[PDB]
Symmetry: C6
Subunit: 61 residues, 6 copies
RNA sequence: AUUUUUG
């Protein structure tokens, strides 16, 4: 299970991740929480709740 | 459940959330009800029964 | 399950809903009958068997 | 289960149905077979095996 | 009752020229080498292609 | 099952895989690891955790 | 509502 380990890892190290969506949209932020379907991303201070079915790629720095 | 506890929060407080669809379009309204597949959003008097598969993110102004 | 309760209501009350597709297209008709995977709509005479995966939102007044 | 009741009468009566795809493109033909995921459509003279996930609506 | 695997089968053995249609509009021609629940392997321009079924719209011959 | 076989192979010898996304875009790299849903691809120095629902084709 | 038909 690479996913939970990766999300867990980001959440922990408070890594600034770039989330690429399927429609070409994107947000740079920090993964705060997450379950089987969503992912909570703190970006520019505002909280964004994201469905994984919309996410495409998670990229680091 | 990160999702459900978030969906209940908006629901309970009549919070004004912005819903972003996978097609870029966005809607603002209160979360009247929800379940495992859809979300009912009261917005501008009219009721919108929205499918989760068509949503990508939730946020507040 | 809010989805089914809302659809029987649209089916019973014989109310004219507007179906918004993911690609931006819209159709305004009446919800004949439905099931798990699809929805039969009587819009502009001819009938249409729509997949819920193509649907974004149901909008009533 | 309305999806099958619909896919049966189209096949049984060799009904000419219009298939609209998610991208808006539309095809015309007769449904010959179908299972859980795909549907075999004969259009003009060539067979097309189509995944339901690629379909938007059926119209007659 | 499962025509998907009945169709993917005849193709494989007869190495018949199949034309794959992607949802994104793309096209690819070739012979079905292998397949399963989630993917399909199509051999085209001397190259191998492992394709997700969720990206495919339709299969057509010739 | 061809998926896990192929995925494991590329991962075995760290092959040069070209991943095509549903939007036609492509990224060339080596499949580090993978699971039922995602795939970790190192390409151009960066590491990308990609969901299988977002991928279209793998090429060698 | 997270890898082939309420996606």
């Amino acid at each position: 299970n690479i996913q939970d380990k990766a999300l867990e890892n980001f959440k922990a190290n408070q890594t600034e991740v770039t989330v690429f969506f399927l429609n070409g949209f994107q947000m740079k932020g920090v993964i705060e929480e997450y379950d089987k379907y969503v992912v909570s991303l703190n970006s520019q201070g505002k909280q964004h709740l994201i469905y994984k079915h919309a996410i495409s790629t998670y990229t680091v720095e």
